[PDB]
């Protein structure tokens, strides 16, 4: 709600924070974001619907300082705001641009829907928002290189969930030509005060998955996340 001016204000703020992405027309960015989903049925959104926005949003970024995450948004952002040379998805133009927002159009109108928008599990899965996030996560993972770090909530009872966004799209789109190692950090939110959580079956599953792709798997516990920062 107040979505268009919010996208424009976020884009303009990001222009100022980064004089590298100053080379950006934010009305152009909003035009492409809009042309992605408006006047379409909100269950037929493909990924090429968003590709003009992806082209306007592709961004020079140190590929060896990417921090993925799955179900820990807050501590990952806390981290990337102290280790100021590492970046999450939400530190990009588009991630910063769409974070925590909701949007959807309607077939046969130029009207943005502020009434209701499709839920991903009760209605359909190819809605504007989830497809946007699928798309940007794919591209973000495709940019990564060298040693890629992913942070995981080690009190989530599936420390690595396959049907996660990280598990679904991000693990299978890290390129073995550029990435040598994926190293997980298992955050201890009081769970298993003493046990070694990298020995969890889901971490072993992720180890097998990323090793079928010719990429090394490392892992490391973080027992007390406070003094870690």
């Amino acid at each position: 709600k107040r979505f268009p001016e919010t996208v424009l204000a976020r884009c303009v703020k990001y222009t100022e924070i980064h004089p590298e992405m100053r080379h950006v027309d934010c009305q152009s960015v909003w035009d492409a974001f809009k042309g992605a989903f408006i006047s379409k049925h909100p269950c037929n959104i493909t990924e090429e619907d968003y590709q003009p926005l992806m082209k306007l949003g592709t961004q020079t970024v140190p590929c060896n300082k990417i921090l993925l995450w799955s179900r820990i948004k807050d501590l990952a952002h806390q981290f990337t705001q102290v280790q100021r040379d590492m970046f999450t998805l939400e530190d990009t133009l588009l991630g910063y641009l769409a974070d925590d927002l909701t949007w959807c159009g309607e077939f046969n109108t130029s009207k943005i829907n502020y009434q209701s928008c499709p839920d991903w599990r009760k209605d359909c899965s190819n809605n504007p928002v989830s497809v946007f996030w699928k798309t940007v996560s794919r591209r973000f993972a495709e940019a990564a290189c060298d040693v890629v770090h992913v942070m995981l909530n080690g009190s989530r009872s599936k420390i690595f969930d396959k049907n996660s966004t990280f598990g679904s799209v991000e693990v299978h789109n890290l390129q073995p030509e550029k990435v040598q190692t994926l190293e997980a950090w298992v955050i201890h939110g009081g769970r298993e005060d003493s046990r070694d959580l990298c020995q969890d079956p889901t971490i072993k599953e992720l180890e097998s998955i990323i090793s079928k792709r010719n990429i090394q798997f490392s892992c490391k516990n973080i027992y007390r996340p406070d003094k870690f920062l």
Partner: antibody, heavy 122, light 108 residues
Framework: EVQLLESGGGLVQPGGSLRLSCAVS????????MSWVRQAPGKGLEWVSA????????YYADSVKGRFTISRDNSKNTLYLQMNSLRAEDTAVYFC???????????????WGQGTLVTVSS | EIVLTQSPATLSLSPGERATLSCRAS??????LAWYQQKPGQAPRLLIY???NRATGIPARFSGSGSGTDFTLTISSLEPEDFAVYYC?????????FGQGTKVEIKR
């Protein structure tokens, strides 16, 4: 008291192999990447290889690819460097080193072992 | 590979002068440059890391500056124990690399 102590020594024939060891104490071994860094006598420091805290991530210098194998036993607090097909050029003091950084990646070394001389000769 | 060129090969300075040691990079390593001190027979001792931060247990007369491709270590008030070879090291990308080193003699 952070301690890094390398083991053995080394006179090998060219084309032979040997295994360098290093025992650590005074820090959580498996919380850190480690690296082997060589120095020929009278020359500079050349980095050989790096391994992650879990032992799953490894990087090698092009000089030693296909011949050297970095390795690590975390239950024994020990870092290994296996060296096969040793050449005369591989003669050097080999140094154990610990990563200062809290994760795998391009390292800076805050602690070093004392070094072991490896001599490749007939 | 990134090549580090440490610019003064040698140095003989009397105790109490300041030593200015240089380290040039072939491409930009940003701030990812550290300094090590090596005394004869000993292993390197970490002095400075990531351009300007001096490591724990290091005197304040050791200071590091620079970025992009130009870096300097400063030994503000020499002592005869400062005799050593000093190396810079980058960690911008693989592989990590060292300079050829500057050996500094203390005069008397």
């Amino acid at each position: 008291e952070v301690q890094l102590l390398e083991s053995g020594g080394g006179l090998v024939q060219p084309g032979g192999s040997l295994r360098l060891s290093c025992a650590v104490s005074g820090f959580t071994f498996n919380s850190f990447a480690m690296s082997w860094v060589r120095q020929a006598p009278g020359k500079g420091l050349e980095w050989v290889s790096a391994i992650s805290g879990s032992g799953g991530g490894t990087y090698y210098a092009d000089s030693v690819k296909g011949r050297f194998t970095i390795s690590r036993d975390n239950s024994k607090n020990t870092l290994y460097l296996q060296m096969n097909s040793l050449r005369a050029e591989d003669t050097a003091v080999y140094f154990c080193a610990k990563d200062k950084i809290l994760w795998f990646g391009e390292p800076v070394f805050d602690y070093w072992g004392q070094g072991t001389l490896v001599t490749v000769s007939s | 590979e990134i090549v580090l060129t440490q610019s003064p090969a040698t140095l003989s300075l009397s105790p109490g002068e300041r030593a200015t040691l240089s380290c040039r990079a072939s491409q930009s390593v940003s701030s990812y440059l550290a300094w090590y001190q090596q005394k004869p027979g000993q292993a390197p001792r970490l002095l400075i890391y990531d351009a300007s931060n001096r490591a724990t247990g290091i005197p304040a007369r050791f200071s590091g500056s620079g970025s992009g491709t130009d870096f300097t270590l400063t030994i503000s008030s020499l002592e005869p124990e400062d005799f050593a070879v000093y190396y810079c090291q980058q960690r911008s990308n693989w592989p990590p690399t060292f300079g050829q080193g500057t050996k500094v003699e203390i005069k008397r």
